[PDB]
From a paper:
For a naturally existing [name] variant ([name])14 in complex with dsDNAs containing OHU, Sp1, or Gh, the damaged bases are in close contact with the guanidine group of [name]. Such conformation of the lesion recognition loop resembles that in the [name]-Tg structure, where the positively charged side chain of residue 242 is contiguous to the solvent-exposed flipped base while the aromatic residue Y244 is laid away from the active site (thus called “242-in” conformation). Noteworthy, across all these structures, we observed an unusually short distance (~3.0 Å) between an outwards heterocyclic nitrogen atom of the nucleobases and the terminal nitrogen atom of residue 242. While repulsion is expected for the two groups if both are fully protonated (i.e., an −NH group in the nucleobase and a positively charged side chain of residue 242), we previously showed in the [name]–Tg complex that [name] utilizes a tautomerization-dependent mechanism to recognize the flipped base. In this mechanism, the base undergoes a keto-enol tautomerization event where the originally protonated heterocyclic nitrogen atom becomes a hydrogen bond acceptor and hence can be hydrogen-bonded to residue 242. The fact that different recognition states were crystallographically captured for the same edited [name]([name]) variant bound to different base lesions suggests that the flipped nucleobase per se also contributes to the stability of the interaction states. [name] repairs a diverse array of base damage, whose aromaticity and hydrophilicity differ greatly. Oxidized substrates of [name] are often bulky and contain non-planar structures; this disrupted aromaticity is expected to diminish the π–π stacking with Tyr244 and hence destabilize the quarantine state. Moreover, it is expected that the bases with less solvent interactions (e.g. DHU) would favor the formation of a stable quarantine state compared with the hydrophilic bases (Sp1, 5-OHU, Gh, and Tg).
Human [name] ([name]) is a bifunctional DNA glycosylase of the Fpg/Nei family, which catalyzes the removal of damaged bases and subsequent incision of the newly generated abasic sites. Unlike traditional enzymes which are commonly referred to as highly specific biocatalysts, one special feature for [name] is its unique capability to recognize a wide range of substrates, including formamidopyrimidines, hydantoin lesions, oxidized, and dihydro-modified pyrimidine bases, derived from all four canonical bases. Here, by integrating structural, computational, and biochemical investigations, we show that [name] uses a triage mechanism to achieve broad specificity and reduce futile repair of normal bases. This mechanism involves two mutually competing interaction states: an activated state that commits catalysis and BER, and a quarantine state that temporarily separates and prevents the flipped base from catalysis via auto-inhibition.
Numbering used by the authors: 2 to 202, 222 to 290
Write the structure that this text describes.
DNA sequence: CGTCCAGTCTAC
DNA sequence: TAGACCTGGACGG
């Protein structure tokens, strides 16, 4: 997922787990190359926050829970197919690679990190990935300053469409978001990044890096809504103006990722 | 049946 | 910088 999907996933965990109590161990699928979670508690709560393309889970034992255990933080990157689902304990979806089990009483649920392609990762510790820039959703002012104070960086030599995927500067921006952002300002995707960013040192490119992904969050859904997978999927596809849309052009960037756009490809075009 | 298509991470 | 990492759906023969 991108920033909006990670943010909605964090809201799903907080909303869905608000009145739940978990017990026992954290179970990893045997095929996951991610680390075992050394955590056991008779009674713990799960909460979440998102920063860009990362999600932090906090496992917080209730007072008197046994065995003795301090809160534990886990940080997730979702890759191409990461998600969280709350399911019945004996109806685990395929590719549920990490599970947290509700304690009794009541219906036995499992909170699952589900990842079909297994591009997703998690680490022990609550640390955000070093070198990842500030969250375009939740840390806009820090994000904007971090870009404008580092335009000398060789990252800004590249086409703007490629610079927008660089997570040191645009933490949370992925492939659909770069197409939607550039389309709203009609900025050619193969314009030089430094030229577009020097020009802004009237909502501009850095502001849309915040307000555009925020619209996706405000839509809700993306697999985390009150509405079915069909209704959430229709609402998202109705919101897209550029990415995959008929009448739009598409090219491969230098890493073979497809950029969608209208009109002028821009000067650094392959 | 087959090919193509949908974000990091690492070896050159 | 190219290839690796992986599964499932759309689609073509």
């Amino acid at each position: 997922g991108q920033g909006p999907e990670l943010h909605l996933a964090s809201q799903f965990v907080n909303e869905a787990c608000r009145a739940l109590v978990f017990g026992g161990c954290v179970e990893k699928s045997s095929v996951s190359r991610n680390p075992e979670v050394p955590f056991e508690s008779s009674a713990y709560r799960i909460s979440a926050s998102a920063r860009g393309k990362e999600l932090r889970l906090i496992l917080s034992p209730l007072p008197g829970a046994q065995p003795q255990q301090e809160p534990l933080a886990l940080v997730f990157r979702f890759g191409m197919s990461g998600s969280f689902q709350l399911v019945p304990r004996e109806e685990l979806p395929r590719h549920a690679h990490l599970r947290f089990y509700t304690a009794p009483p009541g219906p036995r649920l499992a909170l699952c990190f589900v990842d079909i392609r297994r591009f997703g990762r998690w680490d022990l510790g609550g640390k955000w990935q070093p070198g990842r820039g500030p969250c375009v959703l939740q840390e806009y002012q820090q994000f904007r300053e971090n870009v404008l104070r580092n335009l000398a960086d060789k990252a800004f030599d590249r086409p703007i469409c490629e610079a927008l995927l660089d997570q040191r500067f645009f933490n949370g921006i992925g492939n659909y978001l770069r197409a939607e952002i550039l389309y709203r300002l009609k900025i050619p995707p193969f314009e030089k990044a430094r030229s577009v960013l020097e020009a802004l040192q009237n909502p501009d490119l850095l502001e849309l890096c915040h307000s555009v992904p925020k619209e996706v969050v405000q839509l809700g859904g993306r697999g985390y809504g009150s509405e079915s997978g069909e209704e959430d999927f229709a609402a998202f596809r109705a919101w897209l103006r550029c990415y995959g849309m008929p009448g739009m052009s598409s090219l491969q960037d230098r890493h073979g990722r497809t950029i969608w756009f209208q009109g002028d490809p821009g000067p650094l075009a392959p």
